[PDB]
Amino acid sequence: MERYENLFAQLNDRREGAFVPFVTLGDPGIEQSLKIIDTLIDAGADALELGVPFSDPLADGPTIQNANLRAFAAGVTPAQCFEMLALIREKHPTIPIGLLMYANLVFNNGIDAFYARCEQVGVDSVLVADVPVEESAPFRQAALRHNIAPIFICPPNADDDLLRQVASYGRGYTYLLALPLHHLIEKLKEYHAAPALQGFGISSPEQVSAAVRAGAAGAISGSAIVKIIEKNLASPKQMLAELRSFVSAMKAASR
Amino acid sequence: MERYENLFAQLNDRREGAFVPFVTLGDPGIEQSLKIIDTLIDAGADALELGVPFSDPLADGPTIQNANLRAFAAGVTPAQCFEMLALIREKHPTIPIGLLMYANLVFNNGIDAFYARCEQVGVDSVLVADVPVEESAPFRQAALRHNIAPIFICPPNADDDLLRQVASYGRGYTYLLALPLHHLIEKLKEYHAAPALQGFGISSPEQVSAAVRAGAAGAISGSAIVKIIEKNLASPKQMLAELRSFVSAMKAASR
Amino acid sequence: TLLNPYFGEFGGMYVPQILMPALNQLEEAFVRAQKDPEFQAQFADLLKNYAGRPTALTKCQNITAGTRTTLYLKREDLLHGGAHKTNQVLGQALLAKRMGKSEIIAETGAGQHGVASALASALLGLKCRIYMGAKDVERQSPNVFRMRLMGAEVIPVHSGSATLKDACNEALRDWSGSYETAHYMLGTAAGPHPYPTIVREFQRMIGEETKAQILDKEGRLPDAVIACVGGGSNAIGMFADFINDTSVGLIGVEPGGHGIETGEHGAPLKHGRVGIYFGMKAPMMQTADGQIEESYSISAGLDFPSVGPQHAYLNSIGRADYVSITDDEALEAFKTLCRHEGIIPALESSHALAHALKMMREQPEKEQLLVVNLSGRGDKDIFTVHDILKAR
Amino acid sequence: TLLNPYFGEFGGMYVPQILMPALNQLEEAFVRAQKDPEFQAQFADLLKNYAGRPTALTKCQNITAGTRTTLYLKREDLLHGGAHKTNQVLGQALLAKRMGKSEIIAETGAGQHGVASALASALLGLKCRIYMGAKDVERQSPNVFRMRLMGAEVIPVHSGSATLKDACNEALRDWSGSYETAHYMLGTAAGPHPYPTIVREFQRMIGEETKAQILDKEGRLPDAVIACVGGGSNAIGMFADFINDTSVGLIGVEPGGHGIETGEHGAPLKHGRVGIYFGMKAPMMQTADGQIEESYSISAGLDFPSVGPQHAYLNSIGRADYVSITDDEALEAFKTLCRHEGIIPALESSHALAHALKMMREQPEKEQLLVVNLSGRGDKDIFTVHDILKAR
Ligand SMILES: *Cc1c(COP(=O)(O)O)cnc(C)c1O
Ligand SMILES: *Cc1c(COP(=O)(O)O)cnc(C)c1O
Ligand code: NA
Ligand code: NA
């Protein structure tokens, strides 16, 4: 939780936005995945949003859907994910690490036990894609008890009652996915909601800058990164090169 | 009609039974069929029962069923049958000739017209397999008007009312197909029914003699002949030889 | 006979002498049964508790859009078995039992009659042997499995042109010898008396129900009732109860196949000559010198090369009108029902529907209340319709 | 929420935030509808005039010979469509309309749900898109033709292991974006609230009719009511009305597949672990580290790797009992019904029957009045049963 507060503070003094890439743990391989994350961070990523391969991501698109298949095929398991995570943390002590999970993977061995291990490996936040605020009680409380920031998605069709709830319940940051977006950032700030990160379709520097200007604290690059991996699945050396550049670009555009 | 009366008279003075073979007109070929009939007569047949190939003989067995197929395949038609018939008569003026027909072939061009042509070609009797006594009025009357003997089958399950009807309505002969058969011949003779010919399964001399002794005026060899044709369909020269002998045998056993 | 074997000039008992006793026995039994309230009660129980009667009368919603025609469907497709054949097969089965019989004989073409007799037999505990044309066997594998599954013995007949036509012969031959213990369950309102009469009385609930349903829903009788004519049971089933309501039109539809002018059709009532076949005198498909010919239709169920004698009669006196519908017309009627009412009709029943669609389209501002007898469901037909369409 | 999303601990709304508005809208509409007598009247009209309700309750005649068991069958096989699925698909369709929707979204496996949604859509005039697992597509050609024939757009999904599981994902993804104009017609009494509740209320006529029919015919309630459990709609349909008649036993039958001990089965309620999937918390087929696994059964219709939450609940408190029946046991029950009652049941429904046959055979002198929900007809299965038997 602490790491986010730290990040957003530093970002402010330098009056810049946060650039947060998304990646699937173990895609396309474990060592390849680890090599990829080290690049993203070195290339300028402020934080990380990491996915744990799940069998039924009824909340993801084909891009992410295909990422999981690759991981699975690679032999990745939740257990292996946690090993990778301890390793990532070991080398990068300050970088905030958020996890994108599915409710079953969390519920599997008892909720509390899940967050316990998160805290243990040094994970900062967790986003359970299939748990609306309406059913978050157990997940929330467990997260807070293990000093884990429970991340919540703020959808386009978000009403006011929802806005107030997301503001109260969340920590670390707000996942921003009618409503004049400017008013969204507005309402949240007003409700003392955790800093909002713009998540919907951020795939060009133009968009990063816009988000910042719009009042967002930064932007999450949802699948643009997963694309590069795919495009270069063929050639690794270029997978990294393409990664470095893309990130460097997106980052430059946050300042 | 006259021919039958003549035959049965002569047979009596010589105290013998009539041997009547059955054959399909045009089976296996027209000339082959004609050649076959000349043999049957020469071999001793007292009379002839001739069949006209019909598409749906719901009253015949596979043996006769197959005979029709052969004829059809040979290109035989009712019309061709009548030509053959004039020819048979032309060479054999005294031999009684009976036809085995299906009601449609008779009804086709008008009933009366059918019997008219029978009389014209010199046919003595007609058996319409699918016309019970109950529906024979039109066929009967037309037959009588053209001096054609209407033959009727007397079945195993024949009751007394039927016996009286068959006796009154028929001419030429009675087609004999529980009831002590001896009593059948008895009841018929009593009703002044036309001479009864035993039709059920007469395929051995033993049977001819039996029929006679039983009181029948002779026997009709229903399909035994059609069998020989089939058996030797392969070789003609032997088809005739086998025919000659079989008939000579059956005939000898009638005396 | 206790009853009249003739309808005008059509009908009669044109069978070998050997079979008269069997027919006479059957008619006696049917007459006694008809009068037996206990019989009637048993029959009614099965129809309702086992078959699913009364069937629904559905008012079409989309198909008659933009016209002044109100189209209703008699849902015989909803009958256990998925065709109207079930009604009479149960009546016949119950009848064999009343006569103390324990064996049933049937013949089939498309297979629906085989299946229906097999099911009636299974339920009432009768031994069942079904004669089938090896040609039909080969192309009706699925129906053969159903039959066997139901404990019916399927005897493939090859004799002649292995088809219904020949099936009937062996069926009849069998019965000649076994009528003492067995009962012949003829498939339609045809053949020798009293089958045309029996099959009718055992199918007449269709019409009686339609009459009550329509009076309840519309408060008036239909202008016309339309049904397809293969051999004629579904049709007479529908018509029977309306015969005396002279204001109601009766329309029977025969398969036009490729089109009359082609000769490749199955419409003897209107395009054939009366003859003598299957123990009856009625219109049929025959050659010039009297050989019975085969019917033709996309729908195997309409393949009877002749027609029930009561139909030939109703026509003669002008009480009922007969029309033809071609393969192509049936197929479009098929597709149209699927699309607009989400009902898959038998290709047979599609011939009746196609005609009603014709009436509607030709005279769109003509106000008329029609009822089509949807004699069966088309599940059995999707493969046919499939391979037709794909081919196209 | 207006209603309780939970049955004991099972149920809830475990979906992305984006879908909550849609679910909330749906529940509001259902509640208003329930209270709308006009709604109830319209629904009742269709069920009766279009689908064929009430279905018959057949007393078996031969199958229970030599025992003291009286076996009745709820003839859902006689429903238009040939399966119970039709009842709720009509309710849902009517509901989409009340909400001013004009598009329907559905997913399918075996194909029966696709076909049923397609027919409901065709009749009420809704645009219909159906997601299908390309694996299922390949093996459900016939069902695909039916769907297309009915004007439904069939979208083949390959993502993951092209199956229902994945079908559901795209269906859900679609709805997230289109819920404004489209309605998601979920296939069983599962998924997020209020589907488990809706699907139940729209299937409860089965049970209500059974209750009235049995009291009329036997003058007493059954000892037990047996139904198969794929996802649970037919079962809860049957059970719902008898829940408060504590003297009536409720038995749900899950596919045992090759046998439990083999792992190749589809019985999560009794042999799986509760988890969170398809927007609900219920028992399911999952690996040790939480990956959802596939069900297995000879019958594709019983392939749901989880179960409705109300069932998991009824079990928990011991109101209802759940058992399993293997492939082999189902197959024999199939064959037995054909042979003795001349009824071809769905391989699904055969699982419920097989269990009732078990009860009867094990305790032949035990007097008991049973009712089996014959959820469908087996026409769709003859090829399967065929190629199984021939293989043997
Ligand atoms: C058999 C059949 C027919 C044809 O028979 P009819 O004897 O003319 O009534 C028509 N429709 C269906 C659905 C059939 O199965
Ligand atoms: C679909 C189907 C089932 C399984 O579904 P439930 O949701 O468990 O009721 C059972 N029987 C038939 C005939 C079906 O089509
Ligand atoms: Na016909
Ligand atoms: Na299940």
- CA-proximal residue: ligand 1, atom 10 (nearest): C348
Query: Which of C233, C310, C349, C380 for a ligand 1 pocket mutation test, highest count of atoms within 8 Å of Cβ?
Result: C233
Residues that place a CB less than 5 A from ion ligand 4: D 304, 307
Q: Is C386 left (phi over 0), alpha (psi -120 to 50) or beta?
A: alpha
User: Chain A residue closest to D24 (CA)?
Assistant: A134
| Nearest in space to A70 (alpha carbons), one of A25, A120, A6 | A25
Q: Is A61 on the interface with D (CB under 8 A)?
A: yes
CB atoms within 10 A of CB D250: 23
Q: Nearest by CB to A132, from D15, D289, D291: name it.
A: D15
Q: Report d(CA D272, CA D265) in Å as an integer.
A: 10
Q: Nearest by CB to B135, from C12, C168, C173: name it.
A: C12
Q: Report d(CA B108, CA C58) in Å as an integer.
A: 46
Q: Report d(CA D280, CA D6) in Å as an integer.
A: 9
Q: Report d(CA C305, CA C266) in Å as an integer.
A: 6
For the CA of C229, the nearest ligand: 1
**Active site (annotated) includes residue A60:** yes
Q: Which residues pair with B100 in a beta bridge?
A: B51, B127
- Residues in D closer than 8 angstroms to C151, CB to CB, are 338-339
Please indicate whether chains B and D are in contact, defined as at least 3 beta carbon pairs under 8 Å: no
Residues listed for chain C: 392
- Residues in A closer than 8 angstroms to D21, CB to CB, are 157, 159
What would the CATH number be for the domain defined by A1-255? 3.20.20.70
Rounded to the nearest 10 degrees, the angle between the axes of helix D141-149 and helix D112-124 is 10
Q: How close C380 comes to chain B (CA, Å)?
A: 30
C-beta separation of D39 from D335 below 8 A: no
Structure tokens at B135: 């529906």
C-beta separation of B123 from B90 below 8 A: no
Backbone angles phi, psi at D13, to 5 degrees: -125, 75
Q: How close D338 comes to chain C (CA, Å)?
A: 5
Structure tokens at B219: 């026997």
Q: What is the torsion angle, in degrees rounded to the nearest 10, for the CA atoms of residue C184, residue C186, residue C190 and residue C193?
A: 20
C256 lines ligand 1 (CB under 6 A): no
Please indicate whether chains B and A are in contact, defined as at least 3 beta carbon pairs under 8 Å: no
Q: Report d(CA D392, CA D372) in Å as an integer.
A: 29
- Residues in C closer than 8 angstroms to B55, CB to CB, are 160, 291-292
Q: Nearest by CB to C18, from B54, B79, B155: name it.
A: B155
Tell me the CA–centroid distance for residue D73 and ligand 3, in Å.
Answer: 38
Q: Report d(CA D88, CA B114) in Å as an integer.
A: 68
Backbone angles phi, psi at B110, to 5 degrees: 90, 135
C191 lines ligand 1 (CB under 6 A): no
C85 lines ligand 1 (CB under 6 A): yes
Give the ranges where chain C is alpha helix by DSSP (H): 20-35, 37-46, 85-98, 112-124, 134-139, 141-149, 164-178, 195-201, 205-217, 233-239, 268-271, 309-316, 327-341, 350-362, 382-389
Give the ranges where chain B is alpha helix by DSSP (H): 2-13, 30-42, 62-74, 78-91, 103-107, 111-121, 137-145, 160-169, 181-191, 205-214, 224-231, 236-252
Class of C52-84+204-389 in CATH:
alpha beta
Q: Report d(CA D103, CA C31) in Å as an integer.
A: 57
C-beta separation of C293 from C253 below 8 A: no
Q: Report d(CA C308, CA D241) in Å as an integer.
A: 49
CATH 3.40.50.1100 domain span(s) along chain D: 7-51+85-203, 52-84+204-389
Residue C325's SS3 state is strand
State the DSSP code for A77. -
Q: Report d(CA A253, CA C230) in Å as an integer.
A: 79
Structure tokens at D126: 């809704």
- Residue A43: CA atoms inside 13 Å, Cβ hemisphere, count? 23
Determine how β-strand B196-198 pairs with β-strand C69-75. Answer: unpaired
Residues that place a CB less than 5 A from ion ligand 3: C 304, 307
| Nearest in space to D238 (alpha carbons), one of D266, D206, D213 | D206
Residue C72's SS3 state is strand
Give the ranges where C150-280 is alpha helix by DSSP (H): 164-178, 195-201, 205-217, 233-239, 268-271
| Nearest in space to D192 (alpha carbons), one of D18, D63, D376 | D18
What would the CATH number be for the domain defined by C7-51+85-203? 3.40.50.1100
Q: Report d(CA A141, CA A106) in Å as an integer.
A: 13
Catalytic annotation, pick one of A60, A186, A230, A242: A60
Structure tokens at D252: 């749900």
- Residue C147: CA atoms inside 13 Å, Cβ hemisphere, count? 30
Name every residue whose Cβ is closer than 8 Å to that of residue B34 and which is 6 or more positions away in sequence: B84, B87, B88
Q: Nearest by CB to D342, from C49, C52, C122: name it.
A: C122
C-beta separation of D120 from D97 below 8 A: no
Q: Report d(CA C355, CA B248) in Å as an integer.
A: 66
Q: Report d(CA C253, CA C350) in Å as an integer.
A: 10
Interchain pair C382, D142: CB under 8 A: yes
CA distances from D290 to D272, D276, D295, D317 (A): 11, 9, 15, 26
Q: Report d(CA C352, CA C373) in Å as an integer.
A: 7
Q: Report d(CA C371, CA A16) in Å as an integer.
A: 77
C-beta separation of B81 from B88 below 8 A: no
User: Chain D residue closest to A129 (CA)?
Assistant: D16
- In Å, the largest CA–CA distance within chain D is 60
Determine how β-strand D10-14 pairs with β-strand D279-284. Answer: antiparallel
CA B158 to chain centre: 20
Q: How close B87 comes to chain C (CA, Å)?
A: 21
C-beta separation of A129 from A101 below 8 A: yes
Interchain pair B134, C168: CB under 8 A: no
D86 lines ligand 2 (CB under 6 A): no
| Nearest in space to C86 (alpha carbons), one of C46, C59, C56 | C46
C109 lines ligand 1 (CB under 6 A): no
C-beta separation of D168 from D107 below 8 A: yes
CA C28 to chain centre: 24
Determine how β-strand D10-14 pairs with β-strand D6-7. Answer: antiparallel
Q: Which residues pair with A128 in a beta bridge?
A: A101
C375 lines ligand 1 (CB under 6 A): yes
C-beta separation of D372 from D356 below 8 A: yes
Q: Nearest by CB to C169, from B58, B103, B131: name it.
A: B58
Q: Is C66 exposed, middle or buried (0-12, 13-18, 19+ CB in 10 A)?
A: exposed
Interchain pair D149, C56: CB under 8 A: no
C228 lines ligand 1 (CB under 6 A): yes
CA distances from D274 to B199, B238, C384, D164, D308 (A): 83, 87, 46, 20, 12
Q: Which residues pair with D227 in a beta bridge?
A: D252
Q: Is B122 exposed, middle or buried (0-12, 13-18, 19+ CB in 10 A)?
A: middle
End-to-end CA distance of chain D: 54
What is the DSSP secondary-structure string of B56-110?
--TT--HHHHHHHHHHHHHT--HHHHHHHHHHHHHH-SSS-EEEEE-HHHHHTT-
| Nearest in space to B59 (alpha carbons), one of B130, B128, B125 | B130
| Nearest in space to A118 (alpha carbons), one of A132, A104, A99 | A99
Query: Which of C84, C86, C310 for a ligand 1 pocket mutation test, highest count of atoms within 8 Å of Cβ?
Result: C84
Q: Is the dihedral of CA C300, C305, C311, C316 positive or negative?
A: positive
- What is the per-residue burial (b if ≥16 Cβ within 10 Å, else e) of B215-234? bbbbbbbbbbbbebbbebee
Q: Is B152 on the interface with C (CB under 8 A)?
A: yes
C-beta separation of D253 from D324 below 8 A: yes
Q: Report d(CA B37, CA C86) in Å as an integer.
A: 52
Query: Which of C203, C322, C375, C381 for a ligand 1 pocket mutation test, highest count of atoms within 8 Å of Cβ?
Result: C375
Q: Is C216 exposed, middle or buried (0-12, 13-18, 19+ CB in 10 A)?
A: exposed
Q: Is B96 exposed, middle or buried (0-12, 13-18, 19+ CB in 10 A)?
A: buried
- Residues in C closer than 8 angstroms to D116, CB to CB, are none
Rounded to the nearest 10 degrees, the angle between the axes of helix A224-231 and helix A236-252 is 150
Interchain pair D290, A78: CB under 8 A: yes
Structural domain boundaries in chain B: 1-255
Catalytic annotation, pick one of D60, D128, D168, D228: D60
Q: Report d(CA D10, CA D12) in Å as an integer.
A: 7
Q: How close D74 comes to chain C (CA, Å)?
A: 10
Q: Is the dihedral of CA C265, C270, C271, C274 positive or negative?
A: positive
Starting at the edge strand found earlier in the chain, the sheet holding C279-284 runs: C6-7, C10-14, C279-284, C273-277
Interchain pair C21, B58: CB under 8 A: no
| Nearest in space to A194 (alpha carbons), one of A172, A212, A162, A214 | A172
Interchain pair C20, B132: CB under 8 A: yes
Locate tokens 């505990």: which residue? C125
Q: Report d(CA C235, CA C229) in Å as an integer.
A: 6
Q: Is A138 on the interface with D (CB under 8 A)?
A: no
Residue D168's SS3 state is helix
Q: What is the torsion angle, in degrees rounded to the nearest 10, for the CA atoms of residue C113, residue C116, residue C117 and residue C119?
A: 160
D301 lines ligand 2 (CB under 6 A): yes
User: Chain C residue closest to B127 (CA)?
Assistant: C16
> Which chains are adjacent to chain A, needing at least 3 Cβ pairs under 8 Å?
D
| Nearest in space to D223 (alpha carbons), one of D245, D208, D206, D244 | D245
Q: Is C164 exposed, middle or buried (0-12, 13-18, 19+ CB in 10 A)?
A: buried
- C-alpha Rg value of chain C to the nearest Å: 20
C301 lines ligand 1 (CB under 6 A): yes
Q: Report d(CA D309, CA D6) in Å as an integer.
A: 8
Catalytic annotation, pick one of D84, D311, D351, D355: D84
| Nearest in space to D375 (alpha carbons), one of D267, D257, D236, D245 | D236
Say which amino acid occupies D373. N
CA distances from B192 to A218, B156, C41, D142 (A): 122, 19, 51, 70
Interchain pair C57, D75: CB under 8 A: no
Structure tokens at C340: 């607009």
E strand intervals along chain A: 18-24, 48-51, 97-101, 125-128, 149-154, 174-176, 196-198, 218-221
Q: Report d(CA D110, CA D255) in Å as an integer.
A: 15
CA distances from D367 to B70, D211, D216, D371 (A): 65, 19, 19, 14
Name every residue whose Cβ is closer than 8 Å to that of residue C89 and which is 6 or more positions away in sequence: C113, C116, C117, C119, C120, C185
Residue C207's SS3 state is helix
State the DSSP code for C48. I
CB atoms within 10 A of CB C264: 15
Q: Report d(CA B251, CA A97) in Å as an integer.
A: 115
Q: Report d(CA D332, CA A150) in Å as an integer.
A: 54
CB atoms within 10 A of CB B95: 18
Q: Report d(CA A179, CA B118) in Å as an integer.
A: 102
Name every residue whose Cβ is closer than 8 Å to that of residue C16 and which is 6 or more positions away in sequence: B58, B59, B129, B130, B132, B153, B155, C176
Breaks (C-N over 2.5 A) in chain A follow: 177
Residues listed for chain B: 255
Structure tokens at A172: 């670390």
C88 lines ligand 1 (CB under 6 A): no
Starting at the edge strand found earlier in the chain, the sheet holding C224-228 runs: C57-59, C69-75, C368-374, C224-228, C249-257, C320-326
Interchain pair D16, A157: CB under 8 A: no
Catalogue the long-range contacts made by A111-119 (C-beta closer than 8 Å, 24 or more residues apart): A111/A138, A111/A139, A111/A142, A112/A142, A112/A145, A112/A146, A114/A142, A115/A142, A115/A143, A115/A145, A115/A146, A115/A148, A116/A146, A117/A82, A118/A146, A118/A148, A119/A146, A119/A147, A119/A148
Residue B13's SS3 state is helix
Q: Report d(CA B219, CA B211) in Å as an integer.
A: 7
Rounded to the nearest 10 degrees, the angle between the axes of helix D350-362 and helix D327-341 is 80
C-beta separation of A223 from A61 below 8 A: yes
Say which amino acid occupies D162. A
Interchain pair C169, B56: CB under 8 A: yes
Say which amino acid occupies B112. D
Say which amino acid occupies D61. Q
Name every residue whose Cβ is closer than 8 Å to that of residue C90 and which is 6 or more positions away in sequence: C43, C46, C47, C50, C51, C120, C202
C-beta separation of D292 from D165 below 8 A: yes
Name every residue whose Cβ is closer than 8 Å to that of residue D336 and which is 6 or more positions away in sequence: D63, D353, D357
Q: Is A175 on the interface with D (CB under 8 A)?
A: no
Q: Which residues of C are catalytic?
A: 60, 84
Residue A18's SS3 state is strand
D83 lines ligand 2 (CB under 6 A): yes
| Nearest in space to B24 (alpha carbons), one of B5, B62, B44 | B62
C-beta separation of C109 from C136 below 8 A: yes
Locate tokens 């979906």: which residue? D15
Query: HEC states along C74-129?
Result: EEHHHCCCCECHHHHHHHHHHHHHHCCCCEEEEEECCCHHHHHHHHHHHHHCCEEE
Structure tokens at D306: 């989880």
Q: Report d(CA D325, CA C82) in Å as an integer.
A: 29
